[PDB]
Design a protein around this ligand. Sequence first.
Ligand SMILES: C[C@H](C(=O)N1CCC[C@H](C(N)=O)C1)c1cn(C)nc1C(F)(F)F
Ligand SMILES: [Zn+2]
Length: 140
Amino acid sequence: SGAIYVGNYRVVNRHLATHNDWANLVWEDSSRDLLVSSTTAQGCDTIARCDCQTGVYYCSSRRKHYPVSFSKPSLIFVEASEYYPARYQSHLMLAVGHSEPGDCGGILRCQHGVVGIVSTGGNGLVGFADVRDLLWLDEE
Ligand SMILES: C[C@H](C(=O)N1CCC[C@H](C(N)=O)C1)c1cn(C)nc1C(F)(F)F
Ligand SMILES: [Zn+2]
C-alpha cells in the first residue's frame, strides 16, 4: 500500500483505490494502473520533472529503501494477477529488485522529487507506474 500526496491530490494504484477515492475521483486510467482523488488537506510530496533513470524506491516487504537503475516509461506485457488479466501496461518502468503483493504504492524518487509508485513485480523485477508526464498534478 501507499500513495503520493501532492497539492490537493492523492495518487494511488487504481487496483487499491478505496470507495472514498472513487467518490472523490479526479482521474483514473486502467492501462497505467493509476487513480487520483481529491483531498481536504495539502500534501508535502513534490513531483520530479526530468528524465532520470536512477533513483531509490521503498519496499514495504523489507522495510528498506533500495537504490535502482530503471528503464524509460514504456508499454510492457504484465502477467495475469487477481486485479488484471495478462495485458499490456503503459507508462511502466522496470528495475531489478524485490517486490511482493503488498509492495504496490511504495514511492520511487530521484534528486528532483517523486518519479512514480510500485505497480508490478515478480522474478526479482519491480515495475513502477511513472507520474512525471502528469503536469496537472502541480496546479489547480
Ligand atoms: C503479482 C503482482 C503484480 O505484479 N501485480 C498484482 C497487482 C496488479 C499489478 C498490475 N499493475 O497489473 C500486477 C506482484 C508479484 N510480485 C512478486 N510483486 C508483485 C507486486 F509488487 F505486488 F505488484
Ligand atoms: Zn530526476
